[PDB]
Enzyme design. Structure first.
Site, PDB file in Angstrom:
ATOM      1  N   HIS A 255      -3.279  -6.665  10.325  1.00 20.20           N
ATOM      2  CA  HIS A 255      -4.020  -7.728   9.650  1.00 20.20           C
ATOM      3  C   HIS A 255      -3.750  -9.067  10.299  1.00 20.20           C
ATOM      4  CE1 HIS A 255      -3.177  -5.274   5.715  1.00 20.20           C
ATOM      5  NE2 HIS A 255      -3.958  -4.551   6.512  1.00 20.20           N
TER       6      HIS A 255
ATOM      7  N   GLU B  20       0.823  -1.193   0.000  1.00 24.14           N
ATOM      8  CA  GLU B  20       0.000   0.000   0.000  1.00 24.14           C
ATOM      9  C   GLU B  20       0.863   1.252   0.000  1.00 24.14           C
ATOM     10  OE1 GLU B  20      -2.251   0.541   3.692  1.00 24.14           O
ATOM     11  OE2 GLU B  20      -2.029   2.676   3.429  1.00 24.14           O
TER      12      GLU B  20
HETATM   13  C1  LIG Z   1      -4.979   0.522  11.305  1.00 25.85           C
HETATM   14  C2  LIG Z   1      -5.671  -0.614  10.538  1.00 25.85           C
HETATM   15  C3  LIG Z   1      -5.763  -0.568   9.181  1.00 25.85           C
HETATM   16  C4  LIG Z   1      -6.352  -1.532   8.381  1.00 25.85           C
HETATM   17  N1  LIG Z   1      -6.536  -1.292   7.044  1.00 25.85           N
HETATM   18  C5  LIG Z   1      -7.203  -2.301   6.319  1.00 25.85           C
HETATM   19  C6  LIG Z   1      -7.658  -2.045   4.988  1.00 25.85           C
HETATM   20  O1  LIG Z   1      -7.551  -0.917   4.428  1.00 25.85           O
HETATM   21  N2  LIG Z   1      -8.254  -3.074   4.355  1.00 25.85           N
HETATM   22  C7  LIG Z   1      -8.355  -4.370   4.888  1.00 25.85           C
HETATM   23  O2  LIG Z   1      -8.782  -5.260   4.143  1.00 25.85           O
HETATM   24  N3  LIG Z   1      -8.069  -4.563   6.191  1.00 25.85           N
HETATM   25  C8  LIG Z   1      -7.540  -3.559   6.858  1.00 25.85           C
HETATM   26  N4  LIG Z   1      -7.345  -3.754   8.224  1.00 25.85           N
HETATM   27  C9  LIG Z   1      -7.628  -5.081   8.764  1.00 25.85           C
HETATM   28  C10 LIG Z   1      -9.129  -5.308   9.016  1.00 25.85           C
HETATM   29  O3  LIG Z   1      -9.711  -4.198   9.675  1.00 25.85           O
HETATM   30  C11 LIG Z   1      -9.303  -6.617   9.773  1.00 25.85           C
HETATM   31  O4  LIG Z   1      -8.698  -7.646   8.994  1.00 25.85           O
HETATM   32  C12 LIG Z   1     -10.797  -6.958  10.005  1.00 25.85           C
HETATM   33  O5  LIG Z   1     -11.423  -5.907  10.712  1.00 25.85           O
HETATM   34  C13 LIG Z   1     -10.882  -8.275  10.770  1.00 25.85           C
HETATM   35  O6  LIG Z   1     -12.284  -8.611  10.870  1.00 25.85           O
HETATM   36  P1  LIG Z   1     -12.759  -9.689  11.951  1.00 25.85           P
HETATM   37  O7  LIG Z   1     -14.203  -9.897  11.718  1.00 25.85           O
HETATM   38  O8  LIG Z   1     -11.857 -10.832  11.982  1.00 25.85           O
HETATM   39  O9  LIG Z   1     -12.529  -8.935  13.360  1.00 25.85           O
HETATM   40  P2  LIG Z   1     -12.619  -7.429  13.892  1.00 25.85           P
HETATM   41  O10 LIG Z   1     -13.031  -6.523  12.807  1.00 25.85           O
HETATM   42  O11 LIG Z   1     -11.352  -7.183  14.627  1.00 25.85           O
HETATM   43  O12 LIG Z   1     -13.849  -7.451  14.895  1.00 25.85           O
HETATM   44  C14 LIG Z   1     -13.842  -8.185  16.170  1.00 25.85           C
HETATM   45  C15 LIG Z   1     -14.873  -7.479  17.034  1.00 25.85           C
HETATM   46  O13 LIG Z   1     -15.109  -8.353  18.175  1.00 25.85           O
HETATM   47  C16 LIG Z   1     -15.088  -7.582  19.373  1.00 25.85           C
HETATM   48  N5  LIG Z   1     -14.670  -8.433  20.455  1.00 25.85           N
HETATM   49  C17 LIG Z   1     -13.472  -9.080  20.624  1.00 25.85           C
HETATM   50  N6  LIG Z   1     -13.458  -9.919  21.634  1.00 25.85           N
HETATM   51  C18 LIG Z   1     -14.741  -9.829  22.168  1.00 25.85           C
HETATM   52  C19 LIG Z   1     -15.359 -10.520  23.242  1.00 25.85           C
HETATM   53  N7  LIG Z   1     -14.701 -11.413  23.990  1.00 25.85           N
HETATM   54  N8  LIG Z   1     -16.620 -10.186  23.527  1.00 25.85           N
HETATM   55  C20 LIG Z   1     -17.250  -9.269  22.775  1.00 25.85           C
HETATM   56  N9  LIG Z   1     -16.774  -8.605  21.715  1.00 25.85           N
HETATM   57  C21 LIG Z   1     -15.503  -8.966  21.453  1.00 25.85           C
HETATM   58  C22 LIG Z   1     -14.124  -6.467  19.063  1.00 25.85           C
HETATM   59  O14 LIG Z   1     -14.215  -5.374  19.984  1.00 25.85           O
HETATM   60  C23 LIG Z   1     -14.433  -6.129  17.620  1.00 25.85           C
HETATM   61  O15 LIG Z   1     -15.431  -5.110  17.466  1.00 25.85           O
HETATM   62  C24 LIG Z   1      -6.857  -2.702   9.034  1.00 25.85           C
HETATM   63  C25 LIG Z   1      -6.816  -2.770  10.408  1.00 25.85           C
HETATM   64  C26 LIG Z   1      -6.260  -1.775  11.189  1.00 25.85           C
HETATM   65  C27 LIG Z   1      -6.231  -1.963  12.699  1.00 25.85           C
END
Ligand SMILES: Cc1cc2nc3c(=O)[nH]c(=O)nc-3n(C[C@H](O)[C@H](O)[C@H](O)COP(=O)(O)OP(=O)(O)OC[C@H]3O[C@@H](n4cnc5c(N)ncnc54)[C@H](O)[C@@H]3O)c2cc1C
Length: 498
Positions: free
Chosen positions: A439, A353
């Site tokens: 990620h 990126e």
């Molecule tokens: C700075 C940054 C930049 C990024 N840029 C990109 C991008 O441009 N494009 C891209 O493809 N990806 C990007 N990512 C990565 C992307 O955001 C993640 O890969 C994605 O959000 C993961 O999705 P998920 O459903 O696995 O979990 P998450 O989106 O992490 O969601 C997990 C959720 O579960 C909740 N949670 C956790 N444990 C508990 C529990 N025990 N009880 C209740 N709630 C709980 C959390 O608070 C959270 O809201 C970025 C991430 C960051 C941090």
């Protein structure tokens, strides 16, 4: 009490799962440990920007931090803060810091919006048990539509001062024989035009992204979760953290759930039970719940693969010092638009990126977030003493990622007669940041800890939905893959199990 389905978390896996459950008529409760981000704060905005961080920036820390790469310019705006249920959580392990979103929408609140399908041949390599035709034919298109992926106007891109930084890296890369690609996004690029024209409130063009966007970004609260709520069959409880999971004596699952206030005070501990339990707590959160359940004896039939197979998507950050005749601009959109795709599935592969920087004055720096192919994996190991999962990853395990990133950017520096910056990531000379992750992928890998649809091995009606399923690497920004795989999984689970 009881509810038919519970979904833990509200990120990408969770949101897809809940929408489809609700459409199938399954009353579903989503439990989110962070906030619903909808309350104007002391500046009248929901989220703080990167040049005015406050408590809202940080999950329970006592000082704000500069975005990685930006310390030299943004440490001046850092301040002490009260520990608060803010939006971005830097999770510190032994030799790795993982950054995750906390709130309704998970990482969609804090991410850069980049919405990219992995290379099919790489998908086929990483998930050989998965039918790639339905992914590419059906589930990837569904995901892109639901997520409201859109594409930047190339004439605007070419003209606007807000993307000079991107055009400079494109030109530099091109002298090394390296090409760029436009990166689709969930940030509304039409909105972003009107921001530049002074027509609508700025967000991407006002140095907002990593602590949330007050405008423009179609995070999951606006897309899948809004639709889930719209089914009439889904509700979301916030500031509710699931702590333990067990298999009830009479069937189904029971959870202990802590309710806190935004200061972190414990208000109540509740037992919630269900028929169907979906984990969408992220690579970190889902894996932690399951290693805890295994080792504390509440889900004793979990297998040895739970916790294994974690990787940081090969994430490495680096920066180049431009010649004085190639300024990157004082005005840089906070949303990337271009990447360098040098990904051929070989171990030299890099997808980088071209990252903006938020300083708001000219620095001549080009910043990059490299995505590499590094076979090293870590393991989450339950620590019963502290009741935490610990990530057994060591910094030397990122050497292959550093090596791949360095080889690519060395070509660009050789073609241009430029050098790296060494001072952006701490006082020690260090051109490659190798101990962060945006990620996180893996921990409960598809086909190893689970079957090929995320059904947890050893258990019925227990599902993992999120980044913990992915085997450490996708070669691109991961959320579109998480979303599409969740679309595939929940459809099948509903058809055969519900
Ligand atoms: C700075 C940054 C930049 C990024 N840029 C990109 C991008 O441009 N494009 C891209 O493809 N990806 C990007 N990512 C990565 C992307 O955001 C993640 O890969 C994605 O959000 C993961 O999705 P998920 O459903 O696995 O979990 P998450 O989106 O992490 O969601 C997990 C959720 O579960 C909740 N949670 C956790 N444990 C508990 C529990 N025990 N009880 C209740 N709630 C709980 C959390 O608070 C959270 O809201 C970025 C991430 C960051 C941090």
């Amino acid at each position: 009490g009881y509810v038919p389905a519970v979904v833990i978390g509200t990120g990408y896996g969770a949101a897809v799962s809940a929408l489809r459950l609700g459409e199938a008529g399954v009353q579903t409760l989503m439990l989110e440990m962070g906030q619903l981000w909808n309350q104007p704060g002391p500046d009248g905005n929901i989220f703080c920007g990167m040049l005015n961080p406050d408590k809202r920036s940080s999950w329970f820390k006592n000082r704000t931090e500069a975005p990685l790469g930006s310390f030299l310019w943004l440490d001046v705006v850092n301040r002490n803060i009260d520990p608060y249920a803010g939006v971005l959580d830097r999770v510190n392990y032994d030799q790795m810091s993982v950054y995750v979103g906390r709130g309704v929408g998970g990482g969609s609140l804090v991410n850069g919006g980049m919405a990219v399908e992995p290379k099919r041949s790489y998908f086929e390599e990483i998930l050989p048990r998965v039918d790639s035709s339905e992914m590419y034919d059906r589930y990837f298109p569904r995901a892109n539509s639901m997520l409201r992926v859109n594409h930047i106007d190339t004439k605007w891109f070419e003209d606007t001062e807000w993307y000079k930084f991107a055009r400079v890296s494109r030109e530099q890369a091109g002298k090394a024989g390296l090409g760029t690609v436009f990166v689709p996004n969930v940030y509304d690029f039409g909105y972003m035009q009107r921001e530049a024209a002074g027509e609508v409130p700025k967000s991407a063009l006002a140095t907002e992204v990593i602590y949330g966007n007050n405008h423009g970004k179609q995070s999951l609260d606006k897309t899948y979760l809004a639709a889930a709520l719209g089914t009439g069959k889904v509700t979301i409880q916030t500031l509710h953290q699931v702590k333990t999971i067990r298999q009830t004596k009479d069937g189904g699952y029971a959870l202990t759930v802590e309710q806190k206030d935004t200061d972190g005070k414990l208000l109540a501990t509740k037992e919630i039970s269900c028929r169907y339990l979906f984990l969408g707590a992220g690579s970190l959160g889902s894996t932690e719940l399951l290693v805890r359940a295994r080792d504390t004896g509440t889900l004793p039939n979990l297998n040895s693969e739970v916790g294994a197979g974690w990787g940081p998507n090969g994430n490495i950050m680096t920066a180049r010092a431009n010649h004085m005749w190639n300024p990157t601009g004082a005005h840089q959109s906070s949303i990337p638009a271009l990447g360098i795709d040098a990904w051929d599935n070989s171990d030299s592969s890099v997808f980088a990126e071209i990252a903006p920087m938020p300083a708001g004055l000219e620095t001549w720096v080009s910043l990059y977030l490299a995505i590499t192919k590094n076979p090293q994996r870590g393991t989450f190991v339950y620590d019963a003493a502290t009741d935490r999962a610990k990530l057994n990853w060591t910094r030397d395990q990122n050497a292959p990622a550093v090596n791949a990133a360095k080889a690519l950017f060395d070509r660009i520096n050789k073609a241009n007669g430029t050098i790296y910056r060494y001072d952006l990531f701490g006082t020690q000379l260090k051109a490659f940041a190798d101990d962060f992750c945006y990620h996180p992928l893996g921990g409960c890998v598809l086909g190893k800890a689970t079957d090929d649809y995320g059904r947890v091995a050893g258990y019925k009606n227990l599902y993992v939905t999120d980044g913990s399923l992915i085997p450490g690497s996708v070669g691109v920004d991961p959320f579109v893959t998480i979303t599409a795989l969740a679309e595939r999984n929940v459809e099948r689970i509903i058809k055969q199990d519900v």
